[PDB]
Design a protein around this ligand. Structure first.
Ligand SMILES: [Zn+2]
Ligand SMILES: [Zn+2]
Ligand SMILES: [Zn+2]
Lengths: 216, 539, 78, 44, 105, 221, 111, 81, 260
C-alpha cells in the first residue's frame, strides 16, 4: 500500500531531502513537498534519539561562562573575586558581627565607567541567521571544510613565489578524477588567452559604492 | 508680517496685534530673483502673492496655512481684481503684456491634465532622445476594434435572418455609436484580450502612432533599447501572451514583437515576431542585449535578422518572473512569490549565476535599486521592504550545497513598513529643485507618498519620541493600534510614520503643551521641526 | 579507498592544517590525526575518510605534492 | 597598451556571443546557443 | 491563573461590566498574573455580574476593592480579547486548604 | 425567526421603507432578477432585469446590480439601482392594500459604475465611481414622462426571453460637479519631459475606456 | 537606514459613502471612506460644488460604514466597523471640526 | 492513551471555537480548504487586494466579491474521501 | 520620603534585617519588603544593596530566593540597569545551581519591568542566554525561555530581530521536552517571539513537521501552529506556501498569482 523510497524520490521535484521514514507518513507527497520548500527549517534531529536532549557525556566538561569584553573592562570580576575570596575565610562569628556594624563604600565602581560599558563599548555578538538550529554536538563540529584553488596564509610552509608546487605534477599525472569541473592555471586555465581577470578589473572600475540613505 | 529679500527667501513672521513684537520667523526659499509681495483676495480672505522667478501664493485653507506656487510663467507685478466676469481674480502685468488670472481650485497639491487611452495602461517607457512615451494597454474580457466590427456585422446579418423593414433597423444599428467611455465597453468572455501599443507626445497629448494586436494577444512588457551590435538604432520590444486564461491559469504561448523607432520617434516599423513558450513578463535592456524572463526562465536575447537569438538561459528561478532590474553585471529578479534573487552575468563563461537571495516569501509587485547593494520592493499586500546585501558577499560563484533550499548567501531585510494600500510604483528621485533625494511610491488607491532618510541621530531621536508620545496620547480613530497596524505582516522596522506625527497640529492645546514639555520644546518649535523635513524634501 | 594512511610528519603540523593540506587536493570529510595524551605530542601518521572513492584514488598522488617542514609524507589506501 | 586592452575586450565580446575558442586561431559555433543561419563565421 | 492548570475562565462575550479585584488581588493582571505595567481595563460578561455577584473579585471572588486591568504584555499579545476572564471554578487548591484548616481548627 | 430558501443566489438586499410609510420587506437583488419578499402571507414577486437591446456582450454572462440607493419622500419612495453595465433603473413598488403586487422598473440613465450612490435631499445624486473620477449630478426630472416603456413583474413574459430597453444620453440628470481621482495609479514615472526645471509626474490610471495618462505638476491650476 | 514617511497626496478612491445630517443642522453631508481615511464632504446646493470639510486618517481598514439616528434625533452618528476588532461610534463636532469618538466596544481579535 | 484522548478533546474544542485550527490528524484537504477560505475573507476585507483583482480581470468589484463568495462553498474541490 | 533621618549604616543594617522578612507566610509582607529594597538603594546606592541580595541566593528554600530575585530586579529598574548588570552577570559564573537559576530568574523579571528600555541591553545579555539554553539542566532552559518571552515583547517595534532570531535557534530544539513547566515556558517564549519577529518566521519553523510521520513530532508541531493561527490568522495569508494541484482537487491560490 505504501511507496518505497525510490518511487518517492523520483516523484519529488527534489529528491535529496527524502529519508527512510518519510514513506511511513500518512501523506508522503505533501511531506516531501514541504521539506523541499524554501526557507523552512528542518525538524530537530534528536526526535528519534533515545537519549534525552543535551544529556550526553561530552556536556559534562563544559567550562564556565565567560563575560563579554566590554564588561570585563569594568573590573567587576576582579573586585567581586577578591571579595568572595575574603568571605570564605571569615567565620560565622565575624560574618554575623559585620552584619550589625556594616562597612560602607566597599565595592563601588564609578557610574561613568559603568555607563560607558553599556552605552559606548557595547558590541554586537556573533549571531546566527534563521534556520541555523542548535543541536548537541554543534559547537565542536563547527570547524567545517576551504577548496582547491584557495589556500591559507599558513599553508608560509610552502614558501613559494606566487603557482602551486604540486601542479608541476598535476599536469604530469593528469586532472584528478574526483573533481570533474576543477580549473587550475596552466592545465586548462589561463596563467589560450587570459582576459578573465581584466573583466573583474573593468567591472570594479564601473561600480559606484555609495550606500543610499545612511547617516551623515 | 511677510517680508521678501534680495536672496529670494520669504519670511513670514508673527506680529503681536496689541503690542507689536515680532515673534517667530519661518523662512522659505522660493525662486531665484528678488521677491515682491502684493496683497490679494481669495475666498473672501486676504491671501498674499509673492512673485520671484516663479510666483508663490500664500493662503489659508481649512484654517491651515499653505504655500504653493502658481504653475504659470513669471509676472512682473500683480494686484487684486473683481468684476462680473470673474468675481475674485488677479490682474498681472508681465513685461509688455497685461492679463487677468483666476485660480479655480485652491487647497490642492497637484494640478493635473488628462489624456485618454483605450484600455488599461500596463507599462510605459520614455524614448530618451525624442521624449515620447511608448504605452502598452491591455484588457481581459475585451474586444479589439476589428473583432467588434465583425461581431456587429454578424448581428446585423442576424437581424435580417430573423425576419423586410428589419434591414433598415440593422442599418441604424450599424450606424449609431455609443461613446464607450460613458456607455461601457462590451465584455467578451474568459480568455479574450484586447491590446494596443501607442506612441504619445507628453506635452501635447496626441497619439503619434498606434499598433493594434491580434484578438487574444495581450501585451505585458515593453522596452526601448539600442542593440550594440546592430548600431545606433532604437528598437521597441513588446512581450505578448497568447490565449491566456486566468482561473485556472493556462497559456498557449508567447511572442516578442520587435519594432524599430523611425522618424525621431514618430513611428514604429514592424521587424519580426519571435515565439517563446511562456508569457514574457519582463524585458530589460542589459549591456547592448536584452534580458527576457519567460515564465521561470531567464534568457539573454541578441537581435538577429529573422528573430531574436537565445544565449545562456538560466533555469533555477523558483516561480514566474515578474520584473527584472539591472546594475552593472548584476541582475535582480523579482519572483512572483519567491521575492528578490540576485544573479550575476559573467561574460567569458556566458552564464547567469544565482549568487544571493532573500529569506522571506514576498509577493513582489515592483522594485527599485537604491544603490549597488540595496533593493526596495513592494508587495501586493501593501507593504514596502528594503533588502540589503551583507558586506562580505561575493558574486564570484562558479557553477551545490545551498542553505535552506536556496542560494548559499542570504540578503538582510533592513526595513519593513506596511503602507496600507497596494504600491505599484517605487522610484528614487528628487522632487523639488534644490531638494534632496527620496523614495517616491504611488499606491493603487490613488495616493502618493515619500520615504525620506534621516541625516542625523538628533533628528531621528526627536521624531521617534514625537511618534511614541502620539501613539498613546492620540490613538487611531477606529480602535486600532498604530504599531500593530504598521506591522500587519512583518514587524515594522526603521520607519517613523509621519502621518501620525503631523497629527500633532490637530491635537488639543493642553495636549500639545503636555507632549511638548517632554521634548523640552514649545509647540511652535515642534510644528516647525515637523514642517522642516517636509519642506526640505517635498511639497 | 575513502581513507588514507599518512606517515612521516613533525608535531608542529596540525589536524586543521592537515585538512587544508589534503583539501588542496580534495576535501577531507573526516580527519583523524592522533593527539598522544601521555607526553602531549604527535607521532605523525594520519587517516582520512572522503566523500566517496574520488578522494581515495587521488590520495596516493596527493602524497607526492605534500612536503611538510622539508620532508615527505606517506599516503596509501585503507 | 590601451589598444591591447581594447583587443581583449573584443575577445570578451566574442566569448559572450557563444563562440568557443577551442579552435586555436579559429572559433566554433556552440550548439546550445541560437544563431542566425546566414552567418558562417564570427566578425573581427 | 497561570499557577493553577485546573482553573477555567468564563470566556463569554464580555459586556459593559467592569471587573474588580479584592485587596489580596489588588495590582495584579488577571491573565498572566503580573504586578507591573497596567494597560487596559477588564470587562466581564453579564452573567458574571448578576445579582449579588455584582462587584466581586474577578480572580478569586472576594469583595472587590479596585478595578482590574490587563498588563501591557497581555495587550500586545491580544490576550485581552479572549472573553470574560472571570474564573468559574474554585479548583483543587482552594478546596484542599479549607478541609485542611478545618481538620486542624 | 424566519428562514426561507431562495431560488437563485442573491448578492445583496435593500431595505424597503416600512412602518407607516410603505410595506416592510426586503428587495433581494440576484443574478438577472429582482425579488420582493416579506415574512407573512405575501407571495414572492420577481421581475427580470431588462437587458440592452442588441448588445455586444457574451450571451452567457448574467447581469447583477452593483449598488442601490433609496429616495424616501414623505409622499412616496423609489429605489435607484445600477447594473454592472452602468444602467440606473428606478424601482417602484405597487401596493394593493397591505401587500405589494408588482414591481415596476424603469430605465433612468447611464452613469459610470459606482461603489455607492447617495440621493441627497436637495435633488442631487452623488455617484462615487469605483474607479476614476466621481460625479455629482443634479436631478432635473424623475423618470415619469417622455414616453418611455416601463417594465413590470406583472407583465406576462414568455419562457426564455426577457425585456429589452434602449440606452440613450442623459435626460434625467445633469452633471454639475466632477471630483478628480487618481485611482488606480497603475504606473508612474517622475521625470522632466517639459524642460521646466521641476519634474512632473507622468501617471497611468483608470480601468478600460475611462483610463488615461495624467501629467501631475506641483502647484495651483 | 532610518526612513520617515510622508503623504503628499492622500488616497482618492472611494469605498463607502453614507449621507446624513452629520453636522446636526439642515445641511446634508456625505461621509466617504477612502479605505484608510474618513472624510466629510459637504456639497453646496446653489453653487453645486463639493467641498471637503474634514479628512482624518484612521490607521485601519474600514470595512463597513453606516449612518445612525436616535429616535427623534437631529444629528446622525457614524458607525464604523473596521479590522480593529472593535466597533466605533463617532460624532462630528462642527465647532471643533473633528470627529469625536463616542463609543468603542471590543469584541474580537484584530485583522 | 488517556493523554491522547485528552489532547483530542482539547483540540476539537479549539476547532469548534476558532474554525481552522488543526490537530495531529489533519489531512491535506482540510488544511488547504481552511487557508482558501481564510484567503477569500481576507481578499474581501482589504480594499486594495480587491481593487487589484478587479483590475486584473476586467470585472466590477461587486462581481468580484460575489464570485469570491460563490467559491467559499467548495474552494478546493470535493472532499477527498 | 524621609531618608535623611537615618545614617547610611542604619539603612544598611535595617536592610540586612529585611532578609528575614522574606520568610513571611503572608504575601503582602513579602512584596512590601521587596519594594523597600529599591527605596533603600536609592539612598545607600545599588552596590551595597546588591551585594547583600546576591549573597542571599545561596539559600535552599525557594521562597527566599524568588523574592530576592524580584528585589534584584526592583533595584535594577529603579537605579538603571547599567549599575546592577555587571555584578549580576558576574554572579552567573558561581558554581552553584541555585545561584545560576537565580540570576536567570531576576533577568526575567528585569526585562518584564523595564519594557521598551530593554533594547539597550539585549546585546549584552544575548550570550548569557545562549549559554543557558545550551545547558544540560532543564530548569536552566525554562528560566532562559522565560527571559526570552519577556525580552521579546519589550523590543517589539525596535529592530532587534537579529538577536531574537538567533535566540530562536536555541529555543526551538526544546520543543520536544515533556515536562510541563518547561513546556509552558517554551510556548510562552514562542508566543512572545511571534509578535517580535513575525508570524512568517514562526510558520517557517513549523512547516516541515506538520505532516511528519511520528505523532510525537506532529502534535507538538500542530499545537505551535494553532497558537500562531489564533494570534495572527490574518497575517498568515501572505505567508502560506504554494501547494500544487493534485489530480482532482485544486490547491493553487490563483488570484495571488495574478499579474498586472
Ligand atoms: Zn481577589
Ligand atoms: Zn498580563
Ligand atoms: Zn463571565
Amino acid at each position: 500500500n505504501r511507496f518505497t523510497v525510490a518511487e518517492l524520490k523520483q516523484l519529488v521535484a527534489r529528491p535529496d531531502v527524502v529519508e527512510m521514514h518519510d514513506v511511513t507518513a500518512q501523506d508522503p507527497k505533501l511531506l516531501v513537498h514541504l521539506k523541499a520548500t524554501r526557507n523552512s527549517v528542518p525538524v530537530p534531529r534528536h526526535w528519534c534519539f533515545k537519549r534525552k536532549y543535551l544529556q550526553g557525556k561530552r556536556g559534562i566538561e563544559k567550562p564556565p561562562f565567560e563575560l563579554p569584553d566590554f564588561i570585563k573592562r569594568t573590573g567587576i570580576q576582579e573586585m567581586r573575586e577578591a571579595l568572595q575570596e575574603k568571605e570564605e575565610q571569615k567565620t560565622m562569628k565575624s560574618k554575623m558581627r559585620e552584619k550589625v556594624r556594616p562597612k560602607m563604600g566597599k565595592i563601588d565602581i564609578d557610574y561613568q565607567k559603568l555607563h560607558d560599558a553599556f552605552f559606548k563599548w557595547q558590541t554586537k555578538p556573533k549571531l546566527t541567521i534563521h534556520g541555523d538550529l542548535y543541536y548537541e554536538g554543534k559547537e565542536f563540529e563547527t570547524r567545517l571544510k576551504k577548496k582547491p584553488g584557495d589556500l591559507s596564509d599558513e599553508l608560509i610552509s610552502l614558501g613559494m613565489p606566487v603557482p602551486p608546487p604540486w601542479l608541476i605534477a598535476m599536469q604530469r599525472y593528469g586532472p584528478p578524477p574526483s573533481y570533474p569541473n576543477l580549473k587550475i592555471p596552466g592545465l586548462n586555465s589561463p596563467i589560450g588567452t587570459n582576459a578573465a581577470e581584466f573583466q573583474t578589473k573593468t567591472e570594479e572600475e564601473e561600480i559606484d559604492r555609495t550606500p543610499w540613505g545612511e547617516l551623515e | 508680517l511677510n517680508i521678501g529679500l534680495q536672496n529670494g527667501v520669504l519670511l513670514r513672521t508673527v506680529l503681536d496685534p496689541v503690542t507689536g513684537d515680532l515673534s517667530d520667523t519661518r523662512t522659505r526659499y522660493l525662486g531665484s530673483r528678488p521677491v515682491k509681495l502684493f496683497r490679494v483676495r481669495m475666498q473672501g480672505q486676504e491671501a498674499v502673492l509673492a512673485m520671484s522667478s516663479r510666483s508663490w501664493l500664500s493662503y489659508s485653507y481649512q484654517s491651515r496655512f499653505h504655500l504653493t506656487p502658481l504653475s504659470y510663467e513669471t509676472l512682473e507685478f500683480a494686484s487684486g481684481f473683481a468684476s462680473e466676469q470673474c468675481p475674485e481674480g488677479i490682474v498681472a502685468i508681465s513685461t509688455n503684456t497685461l492679463r487677468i488670472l483666476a485660480l479655480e481650485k485652491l487647497g490642492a497639491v497637484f494640478n493635473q491634465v488628462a489624456f485618454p487611452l483605450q484600455y488599461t495602461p500596463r507599462k510605459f517607457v520614455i524614448h530618451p532622445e525624442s521624449n515620447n512615451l511608448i504605452i502598452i494597454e491591455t484588457d481581459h474580457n475585451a474586444y479589439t476594434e476589428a473583432t467588434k466590427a465583425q461581431r456587429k456585422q454578424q448581428m446585423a446579418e442576424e437581424m435580417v435572418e430573423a425576419a423586410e423593414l428589419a434591414a433598415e433597423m440593422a442599418a441604424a444599428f450599424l450606424n449609431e455609436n455609443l461613446p464607450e467611455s460613458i456607455f461601457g465597453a462590451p465584455k467578451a468572455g474568459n480568455g479574450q484580450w484586447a491590446s494596443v501599443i501607442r506612441v504619445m507626445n507628453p506635452i501635447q497629448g496626441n497619439t503619434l502612432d498606434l499598433v493594434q494586436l491580434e484578438q487574444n494577444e495581450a501585451a505585458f512588457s515593453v522596452a526601448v533599447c539600442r542593440f550594440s551590435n546592430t548600431g545606433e538604432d532604437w528598437y521597441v520590444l513588446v512581450g505578448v501572451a497568447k490565449d491566456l486564461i486566468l482561473n485556472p491559469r493556462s497559456v498557449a504561448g508567447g511572442f516578442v514583437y520587435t519594432y524599430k523607432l523611425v522618424n525621431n520617434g514618430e513611428k514604429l516599423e514592424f521587424l519580426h515576431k519571435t515565439p517563446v513558450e511562456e508569457v514574457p513578463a519582463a524585458i530589460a535592456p542589459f549591456q547592448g542585449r536584452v534580458l527576457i524572463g519567460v515564465g521561470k526562465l531567464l534568457r539573454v536575447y541578441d537581435l538577429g535578422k529573422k528573430k531574436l537569438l537565445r544565449k545562456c538561459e538560466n533555469k533555477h528561478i523558483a516561480n514566474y518572473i515578474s520584473g527584472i532590474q539591472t546594475i552593472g553585471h548584476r541582475v535582480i529578479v523579482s519572483d512572483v512569490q519567491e521575492s528578490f534573487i540576485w544573479v550575476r552575468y559573467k561574460r567569458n563563461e556566458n552564464q547567469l549565476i544565482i549568487f544571493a537571495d532573500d529569506t522571506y516569501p514576498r509577493w513582489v509587485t515592483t522594485a527599485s535599486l537604491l544603490d549597488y547593494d540595496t533593493v526596495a520592493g513592494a508587495d501586493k499586500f501593501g507593504n514596502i521592504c528594503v533588502v540589503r546585501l551583507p558586506p562580505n558577499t561575493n558574486d564570484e560563484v562558479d557553477e551545490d550545497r545551498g542553505l535552506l533550499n536556496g542560494a548559499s548567501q542570504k540578503a538582510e531585510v533592513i526595513m519593513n513598513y506596511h503602507v496600507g494600500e497596494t504600491v505599484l510604483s517605487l522610484q528614487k528621485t528628487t522632487l523639488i529643485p534644490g531638494g534632496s533625494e527620496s523614495l517616491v511610491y504611488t499606491t493603487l488607491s490613488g495616493g502618493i507618498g515619500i520615504l525620506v532618510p534621516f541625516t542625523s541621530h538628533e533628528d531621528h531621536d526627536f521624531f521617534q519620541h514625537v511618534e511614541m508620545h502620539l501613539r498613546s496620547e492620540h490613538p487611531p480613530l477606529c480602535g486600532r493600534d498604530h504599531l500593530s497596524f504598521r506591522s500587519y505582516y512583518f514587524p515594522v522596522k526603521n520607519v517613523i510614520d509621519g502621518d501620525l506625527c503631523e497629527q500633532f497640529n490637530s491635537m488639543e492645546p493642553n495636549k500639545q503643551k503636555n507632549v511638548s514639555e517632554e521634548l523640552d520644546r514649545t509647540p511652535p518649535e515642534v510644528s516647525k521641526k515637523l514642517e522642516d523635513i517636509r519642506t526640505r524634501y517635498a511639497f | 579507498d575513502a581513507t588514507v594512511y599518512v606517515g612521516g610528519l613533525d608535531e608542529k603540523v596540525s589536524e586543521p592544517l592537515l585538512w587544508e593540506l589534503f583539501l588542496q587536493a580534495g576535501p577531507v570529510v573526516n580527519t583523524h590525526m592522533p593527539k598522544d595524551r601521555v607526553t602531549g605530542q604527535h607521532q605523525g601518521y594520519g587517516f582520512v575518510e572522503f566523500l566517496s572513492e574520488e578522494d581515495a584514488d587521488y590520495a596516493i598522488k596527493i602524497m607526492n605534492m605534500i612536503k611538510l617542514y622539508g620532508k615527505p609524507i606517506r599516503v596509501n589506501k585503507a | 597598451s590601451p589598444t591591447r586592452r581594447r583587443a581583449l575586450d573584443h575577445y570578451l565580446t566574442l566569448r559572450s556571443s557563444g563562440w568557443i575558442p577551442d579552435g586555436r586561431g579559429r572559433w566554433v559555433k556552440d550548439e546550445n546557443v541560437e544563431f542566425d543561419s546566414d552567418e558562417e563565421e564570427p566578425p573581427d | 491563573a497561570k499557577h493553577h492548570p485546573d482553573l477555567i475562565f468564563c470566556r463569554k462575550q464580555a459586556g459593559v461590566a467592569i471587573g474588580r479585584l479584592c485587596e489580596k488581588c489588588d495590582g495584579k493582571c488577571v491573565i498572566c498574573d503580573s504586578y507591573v505595567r497596567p494597560c487596559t481595563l477588564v470587562r466581564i460578561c453579564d452573567e458574571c455580574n448578576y445579582g449579588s455577584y455584582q462587584g466581586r473579585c474577578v480572580i478569586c471572588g472576594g469583595p472587590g476593592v479596585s478595578d482590574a486591568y490587563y498588563c501591557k504584555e497581555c495587550t500586545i499579545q491580544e490576550k485581552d480579547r479572549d472573553g470574560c476572564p472571570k474564573i468559574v471554578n474554585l479548583g483543587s487548591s482552594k478546596t484542599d486548604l479549607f478541609y485542611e484548616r478545618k481538620k486542624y481548627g | 425567526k424566519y428562514s426561507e430558501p431562495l431560488e437563485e443566489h442573491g448578492n445583496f438586499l435593500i431595505t424597503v421603507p416600512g412602518g407607516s410609510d410603505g410595506p416592510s420587506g426586503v428587495l433581494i437583488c440576484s443574478e438577472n432578477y429582482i425579488t420582493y419578499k416579506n415574512f407573512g402571507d405575501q407571495p414572492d414577486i420577481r421581475c427580470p432585469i431588462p437587458r440592452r437591446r442588441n448588445d455586444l456582450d457574451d450571451p452567457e454572462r448574467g447581469m447583477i446590480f452593483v449598488c442601490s440607493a433609496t429616495h424616501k419622500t414623505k409622499s412616496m419612495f423609489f429605489f435607484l439601482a445600477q447594473t454592472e453595465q452602468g444602467d440606473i433603473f428606478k424601482i417602484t413598488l405597487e401596493t394593493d392594500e397591505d401587500m405589494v403586487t408588482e414591481i415596476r422598473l424603469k430605465y433612468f440613465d447611464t452613469v459610470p459604475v459606482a461603489a455607492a450612490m447617495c440621493v441627497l435631499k436637495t435633488g442631487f445624486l452623488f455617484v462615487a465611481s469605483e474607479f476614476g473620477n466621481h460625479y455629482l449630478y443634479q436631478i432635473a426630472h424623475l423618470g415619469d414622462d417622455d414616453e418611455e416603456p416601463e417594465f413590470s413583474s406583472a407583465m406576462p413574459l414568455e419562457e426564455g426571453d426577457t425585456f429589452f430597453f434602449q440606452p440613450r444620453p442623459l435626460k434625467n440628470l445633469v452633471l454639475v460637479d466632477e471630483l478628480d481621482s487618481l485611482s488606480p495609479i497603475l504606473f508612474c514615472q517622475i521625470a522632466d519631459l517639459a524642460n521646466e526645471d521641476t519634474p512632473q509626474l507622468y501617471v497611468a490610471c483608470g480601468r478600460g475606456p475611462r483610463s488615461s495618462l495624467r501629467v501631475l505638476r506641483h502647484g495651483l491650476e | 537606514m532610518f526612513l520617515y514617511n510622508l503623504t503628499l497626496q492622500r488616497a482618492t478612491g472611494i469605498s463607502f459613502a453614507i449621507h446624513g445630517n452629520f453636522s446636526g443642522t439642515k445641511q446634508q453631508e456625505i461621509v466617504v471612506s477612502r479605505g484608510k481615511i474618513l472624510e466629510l464632504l459637504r456639497p453646496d446646493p446653489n453653487t453645486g460644488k463639493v467641498h471637503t470639510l474634514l479628512t482624518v486618517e484612521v490607521f485601519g481598514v474600514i470595512r463597513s460604514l453606516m449612518a445612525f439616528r436616535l429616535t427623534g434625533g437631529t444629528k446622525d452618528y457614524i458607525v464604523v466597523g473596521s479590522d480593529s476588532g472593535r466597533i466605533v461610534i463617532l460624532e462630528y463636532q462642527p465647532s471643533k471640526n473633528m470627529f469625536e469618538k463616542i463609543h468603542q466596544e471590543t469584541f474580537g481579535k484584530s485583522g | 492513551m488517556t493523554d491522547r484522548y485528552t489532547i483530542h478533546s482539547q483540540l476539537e474544542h479549539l476547532q469548534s471555537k476558532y474554525i481552522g485550527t488543526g490537530h495531529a490528524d489533519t489531512t491535506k484537504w482540510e488544511w488547504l480548504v481552511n487557508q482558501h477560505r481564510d484567503s477569500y475573507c481576507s481578499y474581501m476585507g482589504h480594499f486594495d487586494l480587491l481593487n487589484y483583482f478587479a483590475i486584473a480581470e476586467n470585472e466590477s468589484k461587486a462581481r468580484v466579491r460575489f464570485n469570491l463568495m460563490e467559491k467559499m462553498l467548495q474552494p478546493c474541490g470535493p472532499p477527498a474521501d | 520620603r524621609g531618608a535623611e533621618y537615618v545614617s547610611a549604616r542604619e539603612w544598611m543594617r535595617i536592610c540586612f534585617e529585611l532578609l528575614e522578612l522574606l520568610k513571611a507566610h503572608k504575601k503582602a509582607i513579602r512584596r512590601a519588603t521587596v519594594n523597600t529594597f529599591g527605596y533603600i538603594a536609592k539612598a545607600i546606592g545599588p552596590h551595597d544593596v546588591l551585594a547583600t541580595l546576591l549573597n542571599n541566593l545561596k539559600v535552599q528554600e525557594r521562597q527566599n530566593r524568588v523574592c530576592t530575585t524580584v528585589a534584584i530586579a526592583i533595584v535594577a529598574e529603579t537605579c538603571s540597569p547599567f549599575t546592577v548588570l555587571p555584578a549580576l552577570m558576574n554572579e552567573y559564573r558561581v558554581p552553584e545551581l541555585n545561584v545560576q537559576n537565580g540570576v536567570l530568574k531576576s533577568l526575567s523579571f528585569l526585562f518584564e519591568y523595564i519594557g521598551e528600555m530593554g533594547k539597550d541591553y539585549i546585546y549584552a545579555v544575548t550570550p548569557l542566554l545562549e549559554d543557558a539554553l545550551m545547558d544540560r539542566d532543564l530548569v536552566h532552559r525554562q528560566t532562559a525561555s522565560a527571559v526570552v518571552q519577556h525580552m521579546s515583547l519589550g523590543v517589539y517595534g525596535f529592530g532587534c530581530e537579529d538577536s531574537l532570531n538567533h535566540l530562536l535557534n536555541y529555543v526551538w530544539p526544546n520543543v520536544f521536552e515533556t515536562s510541563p513547566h518547561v513546556i509552558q515556558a517554551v510556548m510562552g517564549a514562542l508566543e512572545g517571539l511571534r509578535v517580535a519577529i513575525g508570524p512568517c518566521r514562526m510558520l517557517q519553523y513549523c512547516l516541515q513537521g506538520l505532516f511528519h510521520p511520528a505523532r510525537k513530532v506532529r502534535d507538538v508541531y500542530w499545537k505551535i501552529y494553532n497558537s500562531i493561527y489564533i494570534g495572527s490568522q490574518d497575517a498568515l495569508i501572505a505567508h502560506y506556501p504554494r501547494i500544487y494541484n493534485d489530480d482532482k482537487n485544486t490547491y493553487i491560490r490563483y488570484e495571488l498569482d495574478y499579474i498586472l
